[PDB]
Design a protein around this nucleic acid. Structure first.
Ligand code: K
Ligand code: K
Ligand code: K
Ligand code: K
Ligand code: K
Ligand code: K
Ligand code: K
Ligand code: K
Ligand code: K
Ligand code: K
Ligand code: K
Ligand code: K
Ligand code: K
Ligand code: MG
Ligand code: MG
Length: 1327
RNA sequence: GGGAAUCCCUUCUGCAGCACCGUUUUAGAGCUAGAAAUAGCAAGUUAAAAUAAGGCUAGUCCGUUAUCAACUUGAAAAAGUG
DNA sequence: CAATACCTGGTGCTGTAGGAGGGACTCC
DNA sequence: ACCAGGTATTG
């Protein structure tokens, strides 16, 4: 018995089919287990497994790290209280106890209900004096009086609990605070550098202009408008824009060639400045430095909006300013509404449901919603002008704890904390002794390279300790081995050398590694001149001279430099032809030039004796990112360099690692030559072997040593998990393997001939970030003129409009937003060649005509017109490098014939790595024996197809698919994959190279474009029967095999199986609901009675459990027999599984039939009467469990009538005539749907509404009626009910809110294919 | 066909370290006329604590990913069954 | 019990290795 | 937004 397997691997489905020699699908009698009167069943060997999407680990990780941070914040507060313990016990022996129980109701409080002072008078007095904590913070910073220890604790604890971010290294307030002073010093530096062209900055209020609550460009324009002979794009204007955070281009200021685009926010600025300082000189370093200082001052003025000379707590002072202006404006606004619009005062200030002030303070109205609600009210009244100004500044009636407080750096809270400590250590000795301890509590962070401070019970931890003792913020440097931990952080993530698996890979920017790369590329260069008979390699001396003259004097070596600065200067060649390199060398000695600029000792870099040292330095610069640790490591070489050079070395850092180890590059030596790999790269006679040739040459010992150096096997699941790909497709892959195992077991452990596999093919925030970055880097204002919300960017044309800066991409013209529907979206490379519909291959233009010819890439004229605009869009990252290269390919010859042939080959031949991994897995599982030559015996051919093959097959032979009808199309795709792949390799066996796993352009283009014509009877004529040319074996009978495919697709019995899964994840909805009298509320803590404290509800059921027992009834507690479904929640699952009987008895059940406990996961299948099926959605809800096997004729009619996806106009007219001749299929389809719904769905109201809706639109165009009949199948689809629209009529979902019936129905346990069943009559349970 | 180093992009998987809000109960004396229901007015911006219940291994650790038909063994892991 | 209608934790930042899609270039 | 299961209100 010979057979093949077809597979369709998706993210939510694995379709499977078994075919025979004649492309038929077998059917078998399968034994049925259980307690029913059915002993066996007929099954077709075709089906599809369905499953919920596999989830990434991201949400779990975010929750885990948030858990850690909550624990550590609690620990900070605990450290502070431990410091305060004894003296607070002297002052108030229950203060911390009152703080701990602040959440409890007075009933459950063991102490007085007023936390700070324990009596109502003192508490009310405190609140009257300090309405916000920031009042107390400012007072404890400024005052000289001894203060109550409890208020000191409250201030310090508030600073420590909410300490602020750590984006800024070093200390703050370094006299970079005043904006006036830094603006004036910038003017000083500018006038020093440009004596002849000075700026009169007198009378310019730099403070108010630069610190204003406005956009960067607006403040730039404001400051420039106060400078007459100055424009915003001049040098001083560019410096001010740099200080404001924009992206100025200093090219035009200095008449440069290199585009000196500078942004202080980017990571490259430090080099971007230095690079710029190369051309203009070092005299301008002070200018850009003053600009950087001014930028710091403006950033601080964003947060501190108060004069810093009246208080040492400007942050708390700014919060108090918020409070005071809120109070004044609230009084004024209340008076306004009292006098003018009194009929609205109650709604504004009493209705929490409304987004007024009441809903803003007491309800759920945010600052934005409150502004939106009150802006028209302020506009409607008189005297609200300053209020509307404050509102449009987003600075009206502000709270202190707000979303934007994320700006506040931790150093400001630290300054306030340090000031309070300095004030109050004069009166409390323990504050003086523990000042730095508290400061350290605030400042200390666990470094990212250290990880969790575990002690052997964390699978995530890598930290190593110097000494075995409890880690605290104060003993961290002594207990934690930061060096070993930071090294393990990297070395656990980095690959070893694959050639030498025990050797660590070199740093990417290692000098030796770059030498290796440069020589490896330079060895394959060839050159010709006039007198030369044949192109020649570069000799060792030639390569060394090129390295010394060009690679060690320029960061990049171009081909022009090679021709002129070497072949002309040294070899005296006026003309030379170069091969092996184009435009410029890819490899370069970048680290060499970095270190040459830093240390300024070329002889030091060139001396081989220092090699090791330099390597180690680069290692330190690559392995570590903490500047203190880098300094500590470089300290061993302090004697070799000046302190200035040592500082500059500290600041330089590298990221990334190579692919080869030092021992491979320059360690192992060929036995006879005694030469390393790099030695051969530098000089190898006239053979000039590169790395690949060197390690594969049988006349050298490199290959032998590599084989010798090679060295536990993964499980199937482990191997699949370690694949690179989405976890969803990995779930699909493992399910595919299990399906194949079961199918082989079905066929009596006989392995198939072939296995044909095909693998299927927030974000608006990403788009808005893309466009913001591109426009601000571009310097455009299209966002000013056209505000847009991230959701709108999901329209393709508008997103393209913004990525193109509102311009045509083929014509140097502006485009109109309001006319986007009149424009075109065009593919850069035509979709007839590259089926690419991403934004990467798409372009918004006024007319696609202006592209040029439609058979190729945009013409040369358009490229010459628009290359500059495209390069600007590329530098703004609004288009990618690939998009730019495809747009500009016409200047490089456009599309060659080889390119089109390759595009069609790509359309047909699968090349994704993950599909190859699936093929390898199946192949290594199926083929395990070796022959006489010890070569693998490939009994099973693993073929991989792309979806376009079977899609075109369906569209060419009218085997159409409609995904909304049911789930049968996955199984049908698997069947068609099996058939098409088997026939394709039977017809052309040589194609086994391309399609089977294991080891002229016009001609190939023609061949691949017409590879599937042997199925056709006439082309653009061919025999009916199609055979193999050499074997003479028949591969396709066009008179009988298409009928076989049609009959297979018409079979109504298809094994659709929904994978039953225990639910995991969160216990319930995260919302912390207010108190409520309901047993649904769940306590957030053991003693927090939800009736008093609120809590959660809506828990997730891990799985239900069938319980057959007795429950007490009535006041008499009489035992009554019951059979019911109990949903074990995810939170209850461990307790239930530890002891099921005790768990159930705690719920109330008595005399539980232990052996009759059935574990029912989600989607458990039950059959009732008339084949009606239900799936377990929960313990108290059901899902639809049946498939609607709509006959093939109705499916094809619906495909054709709805214009689902053309062909010849004669064929189009024939299909149209078929539709119009079979219009009665509409009523027939509605009849099929109605019979199915009355038998199985059981939604009387929805079915009647649907019948009325269909009878209402019977005069509608056939296209529309068919398109909405497509929607109608949501009523009948398998799974959870959902709402659907028939035209404008909306049908809400009918839900099955009871599970009582399945307790007496037939439970069906299905194998992974559903061919093996166990049926349990549940009516025989309970009595 | 498969594979490797380098260059330019683009993207995704795993991990660690942090910040800001939100919510929840309590605290921040509401007043006056009424017996009351209620009416009129005042007021509001802040804090504490929790942020998966919790666990033992007690760490400044772990607690939401992956994996799961039934049945027979078997504590499990596992093998087997049509 | 049925029809119905609501509801559903969110944002921002730093560091890091690896695989893999597209295009070059040299090779096994 | 999604889905789609939990929940209270209504009857
Ligand atoms: K009490
Ligand atoms: K001006
Ligand atoms: K609010
Ligand atoms: K490693
Ligand atoms: K190049
Ligand atoms: K580094
Ligand atoms: K020195
Ligand atoms: K799971
Ligand atoms: K899930
Ligand atoms: K209150
Ligand atoms: K199953
Ligand atoms: K990442
Ligand atoms: K990457
Ligand atoms: Mg906790
Ligand atoms: Mg808060």
């Amino acid at each position: 018995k010979k057979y093949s397997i077809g597979l369709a691997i998706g993210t939510n489905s694995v379709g499977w089919a078994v075919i025979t020699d004649e492309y038929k699908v077998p059917s078998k009698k399968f034994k049925v287990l259980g307690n029913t009167d059915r002993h066996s069943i007929k099954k077709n060997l075709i089906g599809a497994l369905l499953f919920d999407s596999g989830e990434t680990a991201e949400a779990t990780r975010l929750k885990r790290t948030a858990r850690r941070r909550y624990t550590r914040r609690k620990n900070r507060i605990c450290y502070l209280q431990e410091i305060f313990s004894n003296e607070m016990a002297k002052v108030d022996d229950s203060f911390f106890h009152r703080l701990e129980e602040s959440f409890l109701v007075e009933e459950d409080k063991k102490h007085e209900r007023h936390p700070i002072f324990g009596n109502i008078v003192d508490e009310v007095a405190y609140h009257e004096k300090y309405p916000t904590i920031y009042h107390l913070r400012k007072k404890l910073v400024d005052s000289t009086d001894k203060a109550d220890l409890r208020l000191i604790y409250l201030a310090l604890a508030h600073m420590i609990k909410f300490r602020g971010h750590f984006l800024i290294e070093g200390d703050l307030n370094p006299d970079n605070s005043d904006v006036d002073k830094l603006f004036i010093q910038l003017v000083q530096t500018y006038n020093q550098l440009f004596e002849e062209n000075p700026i009169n900055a007198s009378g310019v209020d730099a403070k108010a202009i630069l610190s204003a609550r406005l956009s960067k460009s607006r403040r730039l324009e404001n400051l420039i408008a106060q400078l007459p002979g100055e424009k915003k794009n001049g040098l001083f204007g560019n410096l001010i824009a740099l200080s404001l955070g924009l992206t100025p281009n200093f090219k035009s200021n200095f008449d440069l060639a290199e585009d000196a685009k500078l942004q202080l926010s980017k990571d490259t600025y430090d080099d971007d400045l230095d690079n710029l300082l190369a051309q203009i000189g070092d005299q301008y370093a002070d200018l850009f430095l003053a600009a950087k200082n001014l930028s710091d001052a403006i950033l601080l003025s964003d947060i501190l909006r108060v004069n810093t000379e009246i208080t040492k707590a400007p942050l708390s002072a700014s919060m108090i300013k918020r409070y005071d202006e809120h109070h004044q404006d609230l009084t004024l606004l209340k008076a306004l509404v009292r006098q003018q619009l009194p009929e609205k005062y109650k709604e504004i200030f009493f209705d929490q449901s409304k987004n007024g002030y009441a809903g803003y303070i007491d309800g759920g109205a945010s600052q934005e919603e409150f502004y939106k609600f009150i802006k028209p009210i302020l506009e409607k009244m008189d005297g609200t002008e300053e209020l509307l100004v404050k509102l449009n500044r987003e600075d009206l009636l502000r709270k202190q704890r707000t979303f934007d407080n994320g700006s506040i750096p931790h150093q400001i809270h630290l300054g306030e904390l340090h000031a309070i400590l300095r004030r109050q250590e004069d009166f409390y000795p323990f504050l003086k002794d523990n000042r730095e301890k508290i400061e350290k509590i605030l400042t200390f962070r666990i470094p990212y390279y250290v990880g969790p401070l575990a002690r052997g019970n964390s699978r995530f931890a890598w930290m190593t300790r110097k000494s075995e003792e409890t880690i605290t913020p104060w003993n961290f440097e002594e207990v934690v081995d930061k060096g070993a931990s930071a090294q393990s952080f990297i070395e656990r993530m980095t690959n070893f050398d694959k050639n030498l698996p025990n050797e660590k890979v070199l740093p990417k920017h290692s000098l030796l590694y770059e030498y290796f790369t440069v020589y490896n590329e330079l060895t394959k260069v060839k050159y010709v001149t006039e007198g030369m008979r044949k192109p020649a390699f570069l000799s060792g001396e030639q390569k060394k001279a090129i390295v010394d003259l060009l690679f060690k004097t320029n960061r990049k070596v171009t081909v022009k430099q090679l021709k002129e600065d070497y072949f002309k200067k040294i070899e005296c060649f006026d003309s030379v032809e170069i091969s092996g390199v184009e435009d410029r060398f890819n490899a370069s000695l970048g680290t060499y030039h970095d270190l040459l600029k830093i240390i300024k000792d070329k002889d030091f870099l060139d001396n081989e004796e220092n090699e090791d040292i330099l390597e180690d330095i680069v290692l330190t610069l690559t392995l570590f990112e903490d500047r203190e640790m880098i300094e500590e490591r470089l300290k061993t070489y302090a004697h070799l360099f000046d302190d200035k050079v040592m500082k500059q070395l500290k600041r330089r850092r590298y990221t990334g690692w190579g692919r080869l180890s030092r021992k491979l590059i320059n360690g192992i030596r060929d036995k006879q030559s005694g030469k390393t790999i790099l030695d051969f790269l530098k000089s190898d006679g006239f053979a000039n072997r590169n790395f690949m040739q060197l390690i594969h040459d049988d006349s050298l010992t490199f290959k032998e040593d590599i084989q010798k150096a090679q060295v536990q096997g993964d499980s199937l699941h482990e191997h699949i998990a370690n694949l690179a790909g989405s976890p969803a497709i990995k779930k699909g892959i493992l399910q595919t393997v299990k399906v194949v195992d079961e199918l082989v077991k079905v066929m009596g452990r006989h392995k198939p001939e072939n296995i044909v596999i095909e693998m299927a093919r927030k974000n608006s925030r990403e788009r808005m970030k893309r466009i913001e970055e591109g426009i601000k880097e571009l310097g455009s204002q299209i966002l000013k003129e056209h505000p847009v919300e991230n959701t709108q960017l999901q329209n393709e044309k508008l997103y393209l409009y913004y990525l193109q800066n509102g311009r045509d991409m083929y014509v140097d013209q502006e485009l109109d937003i309001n006319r986007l529907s009149d424009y075109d979206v065009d593919a850069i490379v035509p979709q007839s060649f590259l089926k690419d519909d991403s934004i990467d291959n798409k372009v918004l233009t006024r007319s696609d005509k202006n592209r040029g010819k439609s058979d190729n890439v945009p013409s040369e004229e358009v490229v010459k017109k628009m290359k500059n605009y495209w390069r600007q869009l590329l530098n703004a990252k609004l288009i990618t490098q690939r998009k730019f290269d495809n747009l500009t390919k016409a200047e490089r010859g456009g599309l060659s014939e080889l390119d089109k042939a390759g595009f069609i080959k790509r359309q047909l031949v699968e090349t994704r790595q993950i599909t190859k991994h699936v093929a390898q897995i199946l192949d290594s599982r199926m083929n395990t024996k070796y022959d006489e030559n010890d070569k693998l015996i490939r009994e099973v051919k693993v073929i991989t197809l792309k979806s376009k093959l079977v899609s075109d097959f369906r569209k060419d032979f009218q085997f159409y698919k409609v995904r909304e009808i049911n789930n049968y199309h996955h199984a049908h795709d698997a069947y068609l994959n099996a058939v098409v792949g088997t026939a394709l390799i039977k017809k052309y066996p040589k194609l086994e190279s391309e399609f089977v796993y294991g080891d002229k352009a016009t001609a190939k283009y023609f061949f691949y474009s017409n590879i599937m014509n042997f199925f056709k009877t006439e082309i653009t004529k061919r025999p009916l029967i199609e055979t193999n040319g050499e074997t003479g074996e028949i591969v396709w009978d066009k008179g009988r095999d298409f009928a076989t495919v049609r009959k297979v697709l018409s079979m109504p019995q298809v094994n659709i199986v929904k994978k039953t899964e225990v639910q995991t994840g969160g216990f319930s909805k995260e919302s912390i609901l207010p108190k409520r009298n309901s047993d649904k509320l769940i306590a957030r803590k053991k003693d927090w009675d939800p009736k008093k404290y609120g809590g959660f509800d809506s828990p997730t059921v891990a799985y239900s459990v069938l319980v057959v027992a007795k429950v007490e009834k009535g006041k008499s507690k009489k035992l009554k027999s019951v059979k019911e479904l109990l949903g074990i929640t995810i939170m209850e699952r461990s307790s239930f599984e530890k002891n099921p009987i005790d768990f159930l008895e705690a719920k109330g059940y008595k005399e539980v039939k232990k052996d009759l406990i059935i574990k029912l996961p989600k989607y458990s299948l039950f059959e009732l009467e008339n084949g009606r099926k239900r799936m377990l959605a929960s313990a108290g809800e059901l899902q639809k469990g049946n498939e609607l096997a709509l006959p093939s004729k109705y499916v094809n009619f619906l495909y054709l009538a709805s214009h689902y996806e053309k062909g010849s106009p004669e064929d189009n007219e024939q299909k149209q005539l078929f539709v119009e001749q079979h219009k009665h299929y509409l009523d027939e389809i509605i009849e099929q749907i109605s019979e199915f719904s009355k038998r199985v769905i059981l939604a009387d109201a929805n079915l009647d509404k649907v019948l009325s809706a269909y009878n209402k639109h019977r005069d509608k165009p056939i296209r529309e009626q068919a398109e909405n009949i497509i929607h109608l199948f949501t009523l009948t689809n398998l799974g959870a009910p959902a709402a659907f629209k028939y035209f404008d009529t909306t049908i809400d979902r009918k839900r099955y809110t009871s599970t009582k019936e399945v307790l007496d129905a037939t439970l069906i346990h299905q194998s992974i294919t559903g061919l093996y069943e166990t049926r349990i009559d549940l009516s025989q349970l309970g009595g």
